[PDB]
Design a protein around this ligand. Sequence first.
Ligand SMILES: Nc1nc2c(ncn2[C@@H]2O[C@H](COP(=O)(O)OP(=O)(O)O)[C@@H](O)[C@H]2O)c(=O)[nH]1
Ligand SMILES: [Mg+2]
Length: 162
Amino acid sequence: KYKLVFLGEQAVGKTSIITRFMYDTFDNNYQSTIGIDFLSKTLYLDEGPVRLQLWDTAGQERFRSLIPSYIRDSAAAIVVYDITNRQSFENTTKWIQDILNERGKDVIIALVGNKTDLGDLRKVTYEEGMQKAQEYNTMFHETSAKAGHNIKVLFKKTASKL
Ligand SMILES: Nc1nc2c(ncn2[C@@H]2O[C@H](COP(=O)(O)OP(=O)(O)O)[C@@H](O)[C@H]2O)c(=O)[nH]1
Ligand SMILES: [Mg+2]
């Protein structure tokens, strides 16, 4: 079993990405919520099966004292932002630092730009996201939980190198 924690500002798409991967579905009528959740899934890689334990967190500032417990013992950490929201992107550094403080080098980190189906509303370029990821040597991906685009490769890459 490997603990994968999802971090990021409220409403960027953490719950939706997780749902998309778990049941390959999307709630088009889903109106943002506050809460935490745990879900695990087994992925079969051309090397053997890998059990993943996904932690869906609550990123609002009022829950900051819970961050250490979110990240503790994690094998991987996904920092998610919204490509249409500049402020959610500016906060990625904060989340990446929380990860480094708590786990140092013993964790795989991935930076994800979500909501790629709203390209017309993009406020953060792919370039910017990629540079941030390169600054901290993390993985970089842009996804769309709504359309269900480029999400499976994210979990496959994490489950493979970990
Ligand atoms: N257009 C679009 N909306 C999305 C996408 N992912 C999530 N959303 C919507 O954005 C809102 C916030 O998503 P949610 O998963 O609750 O965010 P969380 O706070 O990170 O868990 C919801 O109303 C979702 O339906 C996406 O890829 N595209
Ligand atoms: Mg959520």
